[PDB]
């Protein structure tokens, strides 16, 4: 249940999401591309899904990848801004869930993003505490897939 | 090219865009739904393109329409944040252009959004000068369609 998952975002979890987002969300192009390049490097088996982006190994030099990466960061910004209202968080999560269901992405494969998130968070000095908070938000999307 | 359309956005135009977005972008849910409902009211021929959203006459109560509307406002947020770097603006514009090209939305049809934008701006007392500024931004997307 996406609603039961959203209910897991307690006061402490929301605070950790906001505090860390203030830092990682300040450089959407840089951190967005880092997130994607890490996903492709650590989980090569997912590259096939991103055929439209061309050669993803080019990273920042790939215009399609950069555009995709920046936009992905705005999806996260959207989620963060909706934390106050669970009904609005759910309707935006379901909107993005559809974007992935049409791409044949399962809850299990969507969860492969947790590794990259933990890694980039770690590079900014945000440990497991924060990685786990983000895993809870990702879990809301997983519940809708 | 799209780059030409973007690179032409002047300091004054960017100023008007940012000043007006400070206001209309502050209530993404309210203004996002207002934009969509106005599009459907004045251009009923476009309703068919949004069948995935269900009964759009439901307005705010329609969770799919609400989720779509909020997300659309973040696409605009994305554009506004990239104004000072044409290279970044171009790659995000091309990304969203693909989302509409796949739906067979022509440059002319995409331009139908100018009417609704002008009305929403006017509701907050932003006149023709501002509507013209936004038409120039919409024109950047049209250059990609
Ligand atoms: C924090 C997690 C993630 C977020 C917020 C997210 C967000 C997005 C957004 C905003 C889009 C563009 C939607 C569209 O325009 O159709 C997208 C596209 C896509 N995503 Fe994700 N995504 C995430 C994780 C993943 C993961 C882990 C996979 C794969 C295992 C995945 C696979 C895809 C694919 C295949 C596309 C289509 C790319 C294209 O052809 O343009 N996403 N995602
Ligand atoms: C300010 C201009 C506009 C912006 C920023 C915008 C933004 C968006 C975004 C972000 C999406 C979701 C893309 C996806 O997830 O696949 C979308 C979908 C769509 N847009 Fe637009 N759009 C604009 C104008 C228009 C206009 C004027 C039309 C029609 C004449 C249009 C038709 C569509 C359609 C048919 C969809 C698919 C809806 C669905 O089935 O989910 N858009 N738009
Ligand atoms: Cl503070 C939350 C950071 C989420 C994230 C976004 C992009 C890349 C890595 C992590």
Swiss-Prot record, chains A, B:
Location of the Globin domain: 8-145
Keyword Transport: yes
Residues the entry annotates as binding heme b: 100
Any one GO CC term of the record: cytoplasm
Keyword Ligase set for record: no
Subcellular location per the Swiss-Prot or TrEMBL entry: Cytoplasm
Protein keywords: Cytoplasm, Heme, Iron, Metal-binding, Oxygen transport, Transport
MF terms in GO: heme binding; identical protein binding; metal ion binding; oxygen binding; oxygen carrier activity
PROSITE patterns: GLOBIN
Protein family per UniProt: Belongs to the globin family.
Oligomeric form and interacting partners: Homodimer.
Name listed for the protein in its UniProt record: Globin-1
């Amino acid at each position: 249940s996406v609603y039961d998952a959203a209910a897991q975002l307690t006061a402490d979890v929301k605070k950790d999401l906001r505090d860390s987002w203030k830092v990682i969300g300040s450089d959407k192009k840089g951190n967005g591309v880092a997130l994607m390049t890490t996903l492709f490097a650590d989980n090569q088996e997912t590259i096939g899904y991103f055929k439209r982006l061309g050669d993803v190994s080019q990273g920042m030099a790939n215009d399609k990848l950069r555009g995709h990466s920046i936009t992905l960061m705005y999806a996260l910004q959207n989620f963060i801004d909706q934390l106050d209202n669970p009904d609005d968080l759910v309707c935006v999560v379901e909107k993005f869930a559809v974007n992935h269901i049409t791409r044949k992405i399962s809850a299990a494969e969507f969860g492969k993003i947790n590794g990259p998130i933990k890694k980039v968070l770690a590079s900014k000095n945000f440990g497991d505490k924060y990685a786990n908070a983000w895993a809870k938000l990702v879990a809301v999307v997983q519940a809708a897939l």
